[PDB]
Amino acid sequence: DFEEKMILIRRTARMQAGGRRFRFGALVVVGDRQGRVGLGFGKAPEVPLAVQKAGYYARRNMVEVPLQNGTIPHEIEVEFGASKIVLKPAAPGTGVIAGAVPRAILELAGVTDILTKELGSRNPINIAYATMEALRQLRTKADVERLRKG
RNA sequence: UGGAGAGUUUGAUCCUGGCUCAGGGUGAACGCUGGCGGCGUGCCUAAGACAUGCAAGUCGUGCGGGCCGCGGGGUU
Ligand SMILES: [K+]
Ligand SMILES: [K+]
Ligand SMILES: [Mg+2]
Ligand SMILES: [Mg+2]
Ligand SMILES: [Mg+2]
Ligand SMILES: [Mg+2]
Ligand SMILES: [Mg+2]
Ligand SMILES: [Mg+2]
Ligand SMILES: [Mg+2]
Ligand SMILES: [Mg+2]
Ligand SMILES: [Mg+2]
Ligand SMILES: [Mg+2]
Ligand SMILES: [Mg+2]
Ligand SMILES: [Mg+2]
Ligand SMILES: [Mg+2]
Ligand SMILES: [Mg+2]
Ligand SMILES: [Mg+2]
Ligand SMILES: [Mg+2]
16 A cells, blocks of 8 residues: 655664763655555654654655646745755656665656755655655645636 | 855864865776677877878870881882
8 A cells, every 4th residue: 555665774872971872863755656644753762663653653744646647736945954956847658767865766656757856955864755755745736726717 | 947065284173275086087007817890080299200002184186206116108
């Protein structure tokens, strides 16, 4: 019902008297490839617990993507922190052209052909959040005319 | 009908930031190796110095001859 794929897994460390103590953080995307995505970042003392927790958080934070023939309706440009994401629709037969993080996010959303570009900071966390906010800032012609009814 | 990023400053993080790599290209060279064909291509340096051969001539339907040779005439 729901497909799940992790973006990256890292091991952070705090300092305590006697040595460093580790804590694992993991990004997880979940999607049905129908137009719904979810992104979660889980932290746990061990890796599998962190992956499961990131999956829970990703299912809790969902985004409805307005797909139009497997591509995006209009080009977007999002600044999350110092990271920038540039999304642009593409004609079918092109394929998802993106870095690992946006490729995974958009593929789990049900996108087949799109042109992206990461700018500024390449940080996978900020890039993931920028792509999520980009998909959250998408509008359709129906929504546009819905706003301009008056 | 058109756009992918990654490694690296820290105990860990975010940012700035340089360096490096994956791509394509070449009148290329070098190493190891090396079977055939087609089409291209081949002094990027000393515009340094050059043996040798060839590479710019042709018209007797513009003109008079030289040399060598043959034939026929004016003459016993
Ligand atoms: K902003
Ligand atoms: K690191
Ligand atoms: Mg929507
Ligand atoms: Mg900025
Ligand atoms: Mg930068
Ligand atoms: Mg860098
Ligand atoms: Mg320092
Ligand atoms: Mg270190
Ligand atoms: Mg410190
Ligand atoms: Mg190269
Ligand atoms: Mg190369
Ligand atoms: Mg040989
Ligand atoms: Mg040949
Ligand atoms: Mg030749
Ligand atoms: Mg040259
Ligand atoms: Mg020369
Ligand atoms: Mg005679
Ligand atoms: Mg007589």
